[PDB]
């Protein structure tokens, strides 16, 4: 018998991104080839199969720093982190290969899907 | 130049609610007349003016337990906590007064708005 407020989920995400901007209650640093990105473990888990596996592990859930594979591109990661917190993906000819490789590693299937479609269209 | 994945925000909220169900990375207990509710501080802050003020305070941000005013109804709080994590509000004739009073205390304006409208319609 519930009623639903259409904008609620987007408003929550907007506020989570504002907390990230303001570095409020961020609880992990993701290190990508020495570039560092502060984030909230719960948002990362909610968006990525890799982070869901990492932060549900009984030892890794307590880590304050996570180092990604050295082959991961920091710009690709930055673009995906922004997508996690905003639903908007800054996909460009110059970054699509890195974004797709990063999304495959992070296990973000919808992103991998749109990257494949954009690449196939340019062939 | 971004593209946007329409369902992303709702999918993130669905996953945050799954973490809450499974008590994964919950970091606060809200006590309402001895009833206890586990939650994520970031979701509470993202949904409520009261929790935003509490968890941005330099001392209160570190508390693992928050006690609400004794006049707050635990069922009203439970209904609002479910709304925070799902966008669905279980508003019924038997709970609307408690839900509205709780939403006013929690500073959730959209909820206070729909409660006022539903009450005005029954007058």
């Amino acid at each position: 018998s519930c009623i639903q407020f259409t904008r609620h989920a987007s408003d929550v995400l907007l506020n989570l991104n504002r907390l990230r901007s303001r570095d409020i209650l961020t609880d992990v640093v993701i290190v990508v080839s020495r570039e560092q990105f502060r984030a909230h473990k719960t948002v990362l888990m909610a968006c990525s199969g890799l982070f869901y596996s990492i932060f549900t592990d009984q030892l890794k859930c307590n880590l304050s720093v996570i180092n990604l594979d050295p082959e991961i591109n920091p710009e690709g990661f930055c673009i995906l982190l922004d997508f996690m917190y905003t639903s908007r993906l800054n996909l460009r000819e110059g970054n699509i290969m890195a974004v797709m490789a990063t999304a495959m590693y992070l296990q973000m299937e919808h992103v991998v899907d749109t990257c494949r479609k954009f690449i196939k269209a340019s062939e | 130049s971004c593209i946007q994945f329409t369902r992303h925000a709702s999918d993130v909220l669905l996953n945050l609610n799954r973490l809450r169900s499974r008590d994964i990375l919950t970091d606060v207990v809200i006590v309402v007349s001895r009833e206890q509710f586990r939650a994520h501080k970031t979701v509470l802050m993202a949904c409520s003016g009261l929790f935003y003020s509490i968890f941005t305070d330099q001392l209160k941000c570190n508390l693992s337990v928050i006690n609400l005013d004794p006049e707050i109804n635990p069922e009203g709080f439970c209904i609002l906590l479910d709304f925070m994590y799902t966008s669905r509000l279980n508003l019924r004739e038997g709970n609307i007064m408690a839900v509205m009073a709780t939403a006013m205390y929690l500073q959730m304006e959209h909820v206070v708005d729909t409660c006022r409208k539903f009450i005005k319609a029954s007058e």
Binding site: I3, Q4, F5 | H110
Partner: peptide, 5 residues
Amino acid sequence: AWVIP
């Protein structure tokens, strides 16, 4: 906003 889901 509010709707019947």
